Enzyme design. Structure first.
Site, PDB file in Angstrom:
ATOM      1  CG  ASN A 193       5.903 -11.270  58.431  1.00 41.19           C
ATOM      2  OD1 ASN A 193       6.048 -10.865  59.645  1.00 41.19           O
ATOM      3  ND2 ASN A 193       5.008 -12.413  58.300  1.00 41.19           N
ATOM      4  NE  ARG A 231       1.578  -9.775  59.512  1.00 44.33           N
ATOM      5  CZ  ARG A 231       0.869 -10.979  58.871  1.00 44.33           C
ATOM      6  NH1 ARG A 231       1.374 -11.866  58.243  1.00 44.33           N
ATOM      7  NH2 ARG A 231      -0.021 -11.586  59.468  1.00 44.33           N
ATOM      8  CG  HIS A 284      -5.221 -13.366  60.986  1.00 46.22           C
ATOM      9  ND1 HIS A 284      -6.016 -14.352  61.677  1.00 46.22           N
ATOM     10  CD2 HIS A 284      -4.161 -14.014  60.409  1.00 46.22           C
ATOM     11  CE1 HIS A 284      -5.278 -15.128  61.874  1.00 46.22           C
ATOM     12  NE2 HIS A 284      -4.136 -15.136  60.909  1.00 46.22           N
ATOM     13  NE  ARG A 286      -0.826 -18.705  68.039  1.00 45.54           N
ATOM     14  CZ  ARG A 286      -0.878 -18.088  66.609  1.00 45.54           C
ATOM     15  NH1 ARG A 286      -1.672 -17.941  65.822  1.00 45.54           N
ATOM     16  NH2 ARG A 286       0.348 -17.250  66.492  1.00 45.54           N
ATOM     17  CD  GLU A 328      -1.927 -12.108  55.139  1.00 45.51           C
ATOM     18  OE1 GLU A 328      -1.232 -12.753  54.411  1.00 45.51           O
ATOM     19  OE2 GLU A 328      -2.370 -12.542  56.295  1.00 45.51           O
TER      20      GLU A 328
END
Lengths: 453, 453
Positions: A11, A95, A184, A245, A392
Site C-alpha cells: 500500500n 492497493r 474501504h 476530514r 484488509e
C-alpha cells in the site's frame, strides 16, 4: 513445510510504502512493516518479522523503487529477513484507491490496465498517483510475478443508480463519471463475509450495516450480501466524521469560506481533508483516544467532537436501516475505533434502542481487543451488534493468490477462505490467548460460529 | 365590521415582490399577488382579490420601491382594490431569508437592526440583498407603520451545537459563523404547531418529523416541540433533492467538476443551485408533476429522478427517527409536493414500514388538496402520517401583528392563534366545501382535532 507460496501486499502513499508478507500454504503472516519518508530525506524502514524484535534501518529512498528494493533486501536478509530469496514471492497485491466505474473487481495489471487506471486517476487525485507509482516500482523489482490491483472502490460497484447518482446535471455523470464511489472496500468485503459466517447465513441472505471507523471512517449498507449504499462519495471526503476530514457539509460552505479567506480549490480541498474532522473541531487531536482522554479531562472541544462523531453515526445507522427496508440482521463495528472505542459504541447504540439496537454495556466494555470477533448486543437485542476486527491485507492477499491461480471473480461469484466457519487467523489466535490471561471474561463475548467444529 | 386591522406581508426576490393582505379582526385574506420582472423590462402585477377575477397590469418597476408603490396603488384602487386607503395597513411583515445566529425570533426593523442584517448578508448572498431592498422600499412607501422581519432561519436557532456544528476548523465557526442554519422556518413553525393541535398535545411534548417538500425542500426533526436538526445547511443548498438544487453531495465533487470544466465558484454555485436537482437529473423538468407525468410516459431520467427524491427522503426520515431517540408521534408532509404528491408519499412510506410508518394507500390517494389537513396513515400505524398544508404567510402576519401589539416572543414562550383547536382558515374552508362536492370521500380523512367544538 513448503514455504514457496508467498504473497506480498503493498500500500503506497506519496511518502510511504506499507507491506505485508503472507505465506499462503502455512496460513501465516511472515512479516509486516513500512518504509516512511519515501522521496524525502531520512527514509526509514520499520520491519516486524514474526517472533522477532522490531528492526529499524535508515536508508535513502528518493523513489518508490528504492523503497521496494529496500523492502525486498530486508525480507531476504539472512539475519532479519523472512524469506530465502525474492523468488519465494509468487504474486504481489497492490492497493489502488480509485477504480471509477471501470473496475468492478481485482485485476492482474497489464499495460492496458495501467492505461485504464490513467483514465480514472482524476477521480482519486490524492491517492491513485502514488498507488500507481508503487505498481510501476514493484514491477521493476519483481518482474516475473503477477502484480494485482485490489481496488478500494470495487466493492461498492454493486450500488444501484438510485444510490450512486448525485442530483447534478446528468452530463457531469455522462462526461466525467461523477457519482458516488465509496472506499474501504476491502474492509467491508472482509467484514461482510465474516458477519455472514457469524450469523450462520449465506452472504446473499444477509442484511447488515458496517461502520469502518478508522482515521478515515465510512459506513456501508449491505443489502442481500451486496453494497447498496455507502457514506463516502466521489472521494473519501463525504460522510462520517473523520480524524482530519470534514465528512458531510453543505456543498456551498467551502465556497463561502473561500470568499472569506482567499483560499483556492486545492487549498480548500486540503483544509477539508487535512485540517477538519476531529482535528478541526478540537484544534489539536486526530486520534479518538486523545479525544476521549481530553473529554475526560474536561476539554469542551473534545466533548463536542466526540458527540458530533456519535450523532453522525446515529443518523447514518438510521438512514441505512431505512434504506434496507427491513430490520438489519446485525450492525458491525470495525477498524481501530470500531474495535477499541467502547465509549463511541455505547453512545451510538444507546441512541438507537428504538430501532432494535440494544447494546449490553458489560459486553461492550470487554470488547477492547483486535484479536477476537465479539458479540456485544444484549442477548435479546432484535439487531445483533458485532465487533469484527478487519483484515484488509488478507483480502488483498487472497485476491492476488486467486488471480495468480486463475479462479478469482467478483464476490457474488467467488468464495473466500474466510467464509469458512473454521477459518482462523493464527496471529490473532495467539494474541487472544494473551488477552485472555489478563481478562478471562473476554472469552464470554467471543462469537460462537454456527458450524464451526 | 371594523376593517382597519390589516397586515401586509411581503416576500421580495431579485426580480419579484409577492404580497398578501390579511384582515386580522375579520380573519380573512383580502388579496394576494405578485409583481414580476421587477427591475426588468415588462414589470407586471398579478392581483387576486377575494371574490374577484384576477387583475393583471403591466407597469414599469425599475426598483423595488416602484413595485411596492404599484402594490399599494392596486390595493387602494376603487374598482380592483381591497382597502380604502394605505393607512388601513397597520404593520408590514417582511420575509428575511438569513438571520445568522444573530436573530432567534422576529423583530421590528430599526436602523440598528438593519445594520445587524448587513453583518449576516454574506451568509445569505443569494437572498438577503433583495429581502432588505424590499424592507427599505416599503419603509419609504409606508413610513408610519412597523416593518417587521420574519426570518427563515430563526425557527432553527434552538438546534444544539452537536446538530449545528460542521466538522471543520473551529475558527471558521468562531470567525465566520459557519454552521448549519436551515430554512423554511415559518413553514416548520406553522406545521409543527398544527401537528401538536391534531395530536392533542402541548407542543413541548411533541416529537415529530416534518418534510417541507416544495421547489425547495427540507426536513426538520422536532424534538420536544423545538427544532433539533434540519436538512438544509449554512445555505439552502444542502439536504433533500430539490427542483433545481443538488442537495447533499460530496463537498469535493464541485471542485472536481471545476477542474474538468473551468467553472469558478460563483458559476459552480449557480450550477448546483439552478441546474441540479430534478432539472439536472431529468435535463428538463423542475416541477414534480412533470417528473411524475414523464415517468408514467416511460422517461427513464424522470423515473430515476423520482426514485432519487424518494430514496433521499427515506434516508432522512430514518436519520431523524434515530436522532429523536424514540418513535416519532407523527411525520408530516407539507408544501406543494407534500400536499399533492401522493406517489412520492406512497413510495417514501412503503419503505419505512419497519420504522413504524404505515400509510393507507386509499387515504393517501384522497389527500390531493390544499384545503384540508388529513391523516393518511393506517388506523393502527405506530407513527401517524399527516398532510398539513402550510401557511407561511399567516406566521408572518401574526408575528407582525404581535410585534405591533407588543406581545410577540420566541415560540417556546408565545402562543399563536393557530394553536387553538378551533382555529379555522376561512378560504380553505370554502375551498374544501367545493372539493367535497367532487370527492365526498375526502371528508373521511380530514383530521379530527381533540377539543375542537
Amino acid at each position: 513445510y513448503f514455504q514457496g507460496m508467498v504473497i506480498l501486499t503493498l500500500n503506497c502513499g506519496s511518502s510511504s510504502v506499507k507491506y505485508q508478507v503472507y505465506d499462503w500454504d502455512n496460513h501465516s503472516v511472515l512479516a509486516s512493516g513500512v518504509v516512511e519518508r519515501v522521496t524525502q530525506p531520512g527514509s526509514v524502514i520499520t520491519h516486524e518479522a514474526k517472533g522477532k524484535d522490531k528492526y529499524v534501518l535508515e536508508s535513502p529512498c528518493p523513489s518508490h523503487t528504492h523503497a521496494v528494493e529496500l523492502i525486498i533486501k530486508t525480507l531476504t536478509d539472512p539475519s532479519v529477513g523472512v524469506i530465502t530469496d525474492m523468488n519465494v514471492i509468487k504474486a504481489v497485491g497492490h492497493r489502488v484507491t480509485h477504480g471509477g466505474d471501470k473496475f468492478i473487481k481485482s485485476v492482474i495489471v497489464t499495460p492496458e490496465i495501467l492505461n485504464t487506471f490513467r483514465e480514472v486517476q482524476d477521480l482519486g487525485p490524492l491517492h491513485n498517483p502514488a498507488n500507481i507509482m508503487g505498481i510501476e516500482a514493484a514491477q521493476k523489482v519483481l518482474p516475473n510475478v503477477p502484480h494485482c490491483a485490489i481496488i478500494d472502490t470495487a466493492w461498492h460497484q454493486t450500488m444501484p443508480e438510485t444510490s450512486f447518482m448525485y442530483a447534478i446535471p446528468h452530463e457531469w455523470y455522462e462526461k466525467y463519471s461523477a457519482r458516488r464511489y465509496g472506499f474501504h472496500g476491502t474492509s467491508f468485503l472482509y467484514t461482510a463475509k465474516r458477519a455472514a459466517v457469524i450469523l450462520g447465513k449465506k452472504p446473499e441472505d444477509t442484511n447488515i450495516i458496517i461502520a469502518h471507523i478508522g482515521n478515515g471512517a465510512s459506513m456501508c449498507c449491505v443489502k442481500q450480501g451486496k453494497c447498496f449504499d455507502t457514506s463516502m462519495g466521489l472521494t473519501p471526503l463525504e460522510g462520517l466524521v473523520m480524524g482530519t476530514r470534514s465528512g458531510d457539509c453543505d456543498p456551498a460552505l467551502p465556497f463561502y469560506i473561500m470568499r472569506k479567506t482567499g483560499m483556492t480549490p486545492a487549498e480548500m480541498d486540503t483544509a477539508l481533508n487535512k485540517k477538519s474532522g476531529l482535528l478541526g473541531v478540537t484544534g489539536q487531536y486526530v486520534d479518538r483516544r486523545d479525544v476521549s482522554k481530553a473529554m475526560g479531562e474536561g476539554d469542551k472541544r473534545a466533548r463536542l467532537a466526540f458527540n458530533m462523531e456519535v450523532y453522525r453515526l446515529q443518523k447514518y445507522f438510521g438512514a441505512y436501516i431505512a434504506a434496507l427496508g427491513q430490520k438489519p440482521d446485525a450492525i458491525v463495528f470495525t477498524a481501530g475505533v470500531g474495535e477499541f472505542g467502547f465509549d463511541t459504541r455505547l453512545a451510538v447504540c444507546e441512541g438507537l434502542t428504538h430501532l432494535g439496537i440494544k447494546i449490553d454495556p458489560k459486553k461492550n466494555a470487554l470488547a477492547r481487543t483486535r484479536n477476537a470477533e465479539t458479540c456485544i448486543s444484549a442477548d435479546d437485542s432484535p439487531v445483533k451488534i458485532f465487533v469484527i476486527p478487519t483484515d484488509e491485507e488478507l483480502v488483498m492477499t487472497e485476491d492476488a493468490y486467486a488471480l495468480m491461480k486463475g479462479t478469482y471473480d467478483v464476490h457474488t461469484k467467488f468464495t473466500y477462505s474466510f467464509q469458512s466457519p473454521n477459518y482462523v487467523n493464527k496471529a490473532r489466535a495467539e494474541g487472544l490467548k494473551k488477552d485472555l490471561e489478563k481478562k478471562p471474561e473476554l472469552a464470554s463475548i467471543v462469537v460462537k460460529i454456527p458450524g464451526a467444529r
